[PDB]
A paper describes a structure:
Catalase (CATPO) from the thermophilic fungus S. thermophilum is a clade 2 enzyme consisting of four subunits, each with a molecular weight of 80 kDa. In addition to its primary catalase activity, it also has a minor phenol oxidase activity that is capable of oxidizing o-diphenolic and some p-diphenolic compounds in the absence of hydrogen peroxide. In large-subunit catalases the gate and small cavity are formed by Arg134, Glu484 (CATPO numbering) and a loop of four residues (Gln185, Ala186, Ala187 and Thr188 in CATPO). The highly conserved four-residue loop located directly above the hydrophobic lower part of the main channel in large-subunit catalases is thought to act as a gate allowing access of H2O2 to the lower part of the main channel, while reducing water access.
The E484A and T188F variants were selected because they have a lower catalase k cat but a higher phenol oxidase activity than CATPO. The E484A and T188F variants showed a decrease in turnover by 53% and 48%, respectively. However, the turnover numbers increased for the E484A (sixfold), E484I (fourfold), T188D (threefold), T188F (fourfold) and T188I (fourfold) variants, while they did not change significantly for the E484D and T188A variants. The presence of heme d in the T188A variant and of heme b in the E484A and T188F variants was also confirmed by crystallographic analysis. When comparing the crystal structures of CATPO and its three variants, some differences can be noted. The first is the absence of the polar contact between Glu484 and Thr188 in the three variants. The fact that their catalytic activities are similar and that both contain d-type heme groups is consistent with this structural similarity. The most extreme example is the E484A variant, which lacks six water molecules in the main channel. Although the K m value did not change compared with the wild-type CATPO enzyme, this mutation had a negative effect on the catalytic activity. The channel appears to be closed in the E484A and T188F variants, which would prevent H2O2 molecules from entering the cavity. This is due to a shift in the position of Thr188 (in the E484A variant) into the channel and the corresponding Phe188 residue in the T188F variant protruding deeply into the channel.
Residue numbers in the entry:
A (entry chain D): 21 to 697
B (entry chain A): 20 to 697
C (entry chain C): 21 to 338
The structure:
């Protein structure tokens, strides 16, 4: 409804051309009933021309994504730290649109690739659109925007054959990573569970760069943006993510869409670290360096307000595909820093919309329009929608009484550059030596994961680097990993038949920081929307009765229940043929269905062994699993699952089963099922 | 104008903002120190300059030079008896219009008063969809098949090695094409007449050119020609006037239209048709599918359908005039195409060319292109998509959107439908109908139907144009074609270029004439409102200014645009001699108090030597009503070598008597006895 | 001939599609001799699509202009003041392309409007393309690039009716000039004969901005570019310019084209003023200010080499 003024209703009426002439569109005009098609058929040509021209260029990066409408609510009057109008009163509401994405894949690539993820937020503020174009990882691969095409060429498919679409699993990517050691920190994040988040709702957003908050009095503070998920942090496991990339390439957009439709619209606390201008070089690194975090121990998070996504788009193309974010969409109360990565982005996002939109009036697209008046002397250009009344669009003028008026620090609530900002020195294409430690923070991150988490990251690196054909690249990779951790280099090297180089302890240390572990972030604060697959059978009325009883008690607590059986009927959502363990956060077998789990079981209605495969996959990927009804050992023995296993449930009582199982869904993953080196 | 009103942006108050509503400045770049380099992070600089860098769109492939205005069409009757068309279905029914007038060959910025064919494109924003009649001021076209359009247009546009010259009809390639493609002769004769240099957009007619069909709700059809007949009357420039006006005021026609509308003198046309039976396609001595032919009015009279009035200027020229995208494909139920091969191919071109101009497929969403009725269709996405479509099942046939939108056809939904009587029979051919082969009779009919002096103006336009052709061989080929229309024309043209005309070839010669194609013959203007009177005065004689004031009052009440001219501006003086020229006026009056300025000793640092007399003598030589108000009128006329007995020369002591006579002169408009004949 | 590798010859042969299929292009394919045109007529659609898409956007400024090929010849080894390879040896030749232009008018506006004029030179150097994008007047209207759209909106036609095409003869232009006094120096040049030059060949070219010459040792000097006409300076008179705008809108492009075809290819001495970094504020104004000239009495011209235009284009558009 925030874009209701642009909506077109086709629930009634006769087909028209784009100029409102009623027409047909089902049969071409022909010279006789078996004749050739006539050039004078305007109905044909106008419809096919539109179809022919439907597609626009995909985004150069973050081509794969999904968006939703929502509201931002301020917790306070933040005048004391920023002039930003959207933050100036307790409870002040501002409409938002968010797009989540992967980075490397083209617009049809699977959601559950291993990748960095985007988290872009537009605030339609009463002083203009403000965009925070962030990622789910707080540090970037590179220290200077000029290097972005080198990064993205190296991670994107090899340009002779456009193979492979596995961003982190080919020679060219590891060549870049190993020759550009700045990459180590973001690389360690991408090789962790942060590279395969369970959903958009179960990851954070980060501005990455230091920005400024600027008060009306002109004073400034340095800030980092942190959008902290109220759903909690969760990952897939790789073995799961690969299958899910085939069974459901749309998994993350469907999870978000379903959460909003079910009234479970995801929430983030929008937070900042605030530090003084004097602390730019005080934390043992440069706040202008986007490869570095400020440990929460040095600067705590201040909660500014609530971000809630609660409305799906009406038309995906018009809203999600066409949304054009820019870090240059800035408001009074915010300013840039001399982060050489941020500095260059400001150019890129204004320029790239010419490519996507095919013309300069992209801010006039409904999704890009602000919610306040526009007063400027911008004119003409392809696709001009506005009819400007002012016939003297120049400053300075008298013929339009000197309107529009210049807005600045002192008049018209103008944007203004933080007036304490200076530059001094040579005009240089030189890197600050303050940027030169590429390895300490990667080690900080690694140090801050749990032992099983550390194993998962080593395993992601073993997987990816084992696919690199070049022996010289694999050696260069072990040289860089070794500068972060000798142990990581030895464990990765073991997988690929190379020796790790000798320990180089220059950057080694045992410092740790809170808030970067997924496994370590404890049970989820809510299980609403989590997916329970109930494996039943049509062959036993009592199996369906057990399933209906389990459904009622699970749905009461807001879980999404799928009853699976051989065929569809009342109370069965999916067939075994379409069901998979990647479809569920937990799997329950009703003991009336135990016959389906025998090695002997066979049906033309589903692939050999499908019922037991769903159970075994779910167990092996660490999910809560169990048998409800009391007769558990036929199913558990066929699955090779121990009855006494953590996150393995066997109860006769539906009530006791669900109370135990719901604890399992909160735990989310049972990490004792994964081997350690 | 719902879509146009909704998109209007008022900047009469407020602080400068970005396109996303963030208040900003735009006067100083952000720099690393007061004498420092400009910063990349200056988003205010880049958004403003990016917009500026992208302001321009491709000009139209043809008709690039033009001007537009809003108005209203009012039907005179319920025309159900001849057409299903909803805009014509009731007495007094009003439909908003937008019209764009144009030249053909010139680029943007080329002068209005080039010798050229002119566009007259009319959009009817009807209650059953937008209906465009994309016409010209000349009722016949150069060529008989749309596939030839790039050949014609390459030949008339500047030579592509050096892009010289801008003069469409005055270079080798144009005459090469005309002489090798004899279909061109009829349109060529029109463009070489006064129709090539109209006095204004308001003083020319509009023509559909092609035969179209009127289709009734019973499926029956008739063949029609569109004629928009000026209520201002037909009038031309003279060539030497046009050439000077091209330099003094390249915006003459757009300014004339703008000024007429602002003054409450919005131009009008009777929208008319010739209506003939399908059985008459080949009855009139030529093929109605041939766009090089008119139906003589003597064979098929004009029926007045309604009133076209232009009465509102655009708010933003670029957004409305430059972006308006006309299409003969914009047709409504009750109208149908014919198998005219020129029309047939147009239908493809205008849909395709808007992709070039707009840079994307959503050009019908621009406010000027939008309809005034709801749009229901399954067209989706594309660059610049401005709609948010609620229907998530945009396919036919569907159940998931309850089968909407519904198909519209002859039976239901007031669907467009092809005239059900239309058939095709025969081989699939790239062959020209032999019924199209007479390229010379109608050019001769047109030539025959002009007055003797009008024939001289046409001979003289060809003498001018053909004399600039460098190729002797192209000039000979031209005489060969002209000779097939009229031996006399070929003899008279040949004299100017030092060649002999070929021997008479009487195959296509005849003495038939037709009413309604002559300008010189069309009689006095039915109104003199908007016509321009230059009063030549002096600041050096209070009596000269009083005379000019008394004339101004007396002429302005009759709706004439009066310019008092003197050495310097003051109260009552609109213009200096320095900026004034005879091309700025329809009539020129000298007040006898100004007599002293019309001598040969003359001279002022405030205007070129001889300017005041040059304005009067140019006015006389170009056929305009000219006169002296005073009583020493005797004298000044002698200075100018202008005879007092002269038709359209005035000489009256009384202001009241001077004006009465002078105003008859303005209606006569041109005094053609001032032009030498062969 | 410097672009000979890209030339297409149609002095012989049979008509083909863009993919080399021999075709015809004079009659549409119809369902019978008096029939409607067929959609399957690919000869028609490929030809008319090309025609329909011939036009590109005109330049936002300097839309009206004309170009020619030529040669630049260095008079010396300029190592002493610049590392620039095209200046590194006596007699070193570099191909050039030059375009001359007005500023305000659209691409079919008369050459002889009163206006500033463009003089844009490309040196196709052995160390890359070097462009000097200059005007025939050495000073600009405005002191900051962010003001360009204000200047150009004010001098271009009024945007309600696109009237008038006379850059310097309407309210908005004079409103801008009177509110933005920086415009006075360029305005005086545009109101002199410099606003209506006799030809592109009878005007000079100016870089306008102070640039730097940088030696291979890293030392720098401040320079102004001055292209000095070997044909001499000449103007029209205004009344003449106005008539010529109607009688021959192509007058300057024709003058240039004819001079080249007659073997009178126009020449300029490419010159610089060279001053020290320390003199940025020494001449009574700031060298960073593009509304100011360095008087020749303060800094004489140095001749660097010869610019000669001697070859017309083959295809104007391309
Ligand atoms: C901190 C580093 C970065 C972050 C967090 C980031 C984030 C993002 C995100 C989230 C998107 C997708 C926005 C959407 O969903 O529509 C995006 C797109 C894009 N980014 Fe960045 N980015 C970063 C660095 C860069 C750099 C250094 C460049 C270029 C120099 C760049 C150029 C682009 C381009 C061209 C697009 C496509 C934008 C569009 O089509 O609208 N990014 N980025
Ligand atoms: C009876 C013959 C014709 C008439 C009366 C005619 C009339 C016109 C008019 C008045 C315009 C200007 C519309 C405006 O003001 O925006 C125009 C534009 C155009 N015409 Fe035609 N025309 C004719 C034949 C053709 C043919 C045969 C072709 C191509 C095969 C053609 C292609 C075009 C194109 C490409 C444009 C530019 C359209 C645009 O950019 O909107 N015309 N024509
Ligand atoms: C000393 C000041 C300037 C001079 C001498 C100058 C000169 C020129 C010339 C000669 C051209 C035409 C080049 C050609 O023949 O193709 C041109 C085009 C252009 N100028 Fe400038 N100019 C100046 C300042 C500016 C400024 C301040 C801006 C914008 C911030 C600007 C933007 C442009 C644009 C957009 C074009 C069209 C370029 C193209 O389409 O290729 N100019 N200028
Ligand atoms: Ca590779
Ligand atoms: Ca994990
Ligand atoms: Ca494009
Ligand atoms: Ca020629
Ligand atoms: Ca039909
Ligand atoms: Ca003005
Ligand atoms: Ca002079």
């Amino acid at each position: 409804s925030p874009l209701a003024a642009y909506e077109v209703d086709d629930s009634t009426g006769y087909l028209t051309s784009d100029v409102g002439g009623p027409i047909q569109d089902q049969t071409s005009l022909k010279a006789g009933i078996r004749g050739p098609t006539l050039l004078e058929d305007f109905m044909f040509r106008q419809k096919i021309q539109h179809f022919d021209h439907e597609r626009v260029p995909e985004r150069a990066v973050h081509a794969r994504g999904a968006g939703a409408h929502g509201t931002f609510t301020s917790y306070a009057d933040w005048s004391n730290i920023t002039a930003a109008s959207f933050l100036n009163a307790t409870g002040k509401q501002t409409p938002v649109f968010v797009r989540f994405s992967t980075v490397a894949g083209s617009r049809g690539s699977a959601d559950t690739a291993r990748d960095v993820h985007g988290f872009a937020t537009r605030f339609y503020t009463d002083e203009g659109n403000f965009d925070i174009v962030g990622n789910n990882i707080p540090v970037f691969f590179i220290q200077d925007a000029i290097q972005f095409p080198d990064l993205i060429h190296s991670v994107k498919p090899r340009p002779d054959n456009e193979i492979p679409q596995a961003a982190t699993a080919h020679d060219s990517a590891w060549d870049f990573f190993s020759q550009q050691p700045s990459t180590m920190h973001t690389l360690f994040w991408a090789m962790s569970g942060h590279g395969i988040p369970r959903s958009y709702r179960h990851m954070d957003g980060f501005g990455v760069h230091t920005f400024r908050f600027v008060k009306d009095d002109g004073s400034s503070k340095l800030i980092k943006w942190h959008f902290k998920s109220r759903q909690g942090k969760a990952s897939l496991v790789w073995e799961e993510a690969q299958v899910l990339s085939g069974k459901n390439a749309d998994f993350h957009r469907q999870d978000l869409w379903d959460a909003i439709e079910s009234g479970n619209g995801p929430e983030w606390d929008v937070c900042v670290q605030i530090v003084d201008e004097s602390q730019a070089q005080a934390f043992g690194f440069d706040l202008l360096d986007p490869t570095k975090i400020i440990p929460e121990e040095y600067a705590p998070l201040t909660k500014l307000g609530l971000l809630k996504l609660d409305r799906n788009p009406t038309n995906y193309f018009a809203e999600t595909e066409q949304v054009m974010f820019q870090p240059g969409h800035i408001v009074r109360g915010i300013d840039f820093t001399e982060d050489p990565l941020l500095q260059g982005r400001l150019f890129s996002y204004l320029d790239t919309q010419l490519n996507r939109n095919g013309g300069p009036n992209f801010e006039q697209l409904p999704i890009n329009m602000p919610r306040v008046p526009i007063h400027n002397n911008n004119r003409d250009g392809a696709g001009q929608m506005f009819i400007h009344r002012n016939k003297y669009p120049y400053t300075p003028n008298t013929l339009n009484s000197g309107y529009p008026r210049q807005a600045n620090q002192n008049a018209g609530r103008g944007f203004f550059t933080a007036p304490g900002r200076t530059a001094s020195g040579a005009l240089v294409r030189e890197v600050s030596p303050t940027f030169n430690d590429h390895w300490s923070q990667p080690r900080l991150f690694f140090n801050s994961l749990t032992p099983v988490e550390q194993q998962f990251l080593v395993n992601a690196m073993r997987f990816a680097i084992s696919l690199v054909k070049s022996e010289e690249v694999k050696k260069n990779v072990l040289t860089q990993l070794n500068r972060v951790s000798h142990d990581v280099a030895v464990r990765v090297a073991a997988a690929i038949g190379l020796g790790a180089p000798d320990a180089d302890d220059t950057y080694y240390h045992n410092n740790k920081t809170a808030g970067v572990s997924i496994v370590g972030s404890g049970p989820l604060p809510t299980i609403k929307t989590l997916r329970v697959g109930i494996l039943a059978t049509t062959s036993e009325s009592s199996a369906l009765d057990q399933a209906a009883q389990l459904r009622t008690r699970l749905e009461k607590d807001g879980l999404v229940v799928t009853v699976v059986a051989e065929t569809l009927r009342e109370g069965v959502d999916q067939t075994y043929s379409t069901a998979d363990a990647t479809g569920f956060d937990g799997v329950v077998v009703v003991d009336g269905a135990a016959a389906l789990f025998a090695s002997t079981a066979s049906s033309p209605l589903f692939p050999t062994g499908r019922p037991l495969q769903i159970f075994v996959d779910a167990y092996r990927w660490g999910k809560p699993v169990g048998v409800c009804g009391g007769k558990s050992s036929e199913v558990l023995d066929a699955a090779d699952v121990p009855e006494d296993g953590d996150g393995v449930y066997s109860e006769e009582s539906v009530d006791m089963f669900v109370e135990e199982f719901e604890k399992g869904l909160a735990t989310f993953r049972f990490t004792d099922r994964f081997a350690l080196d």
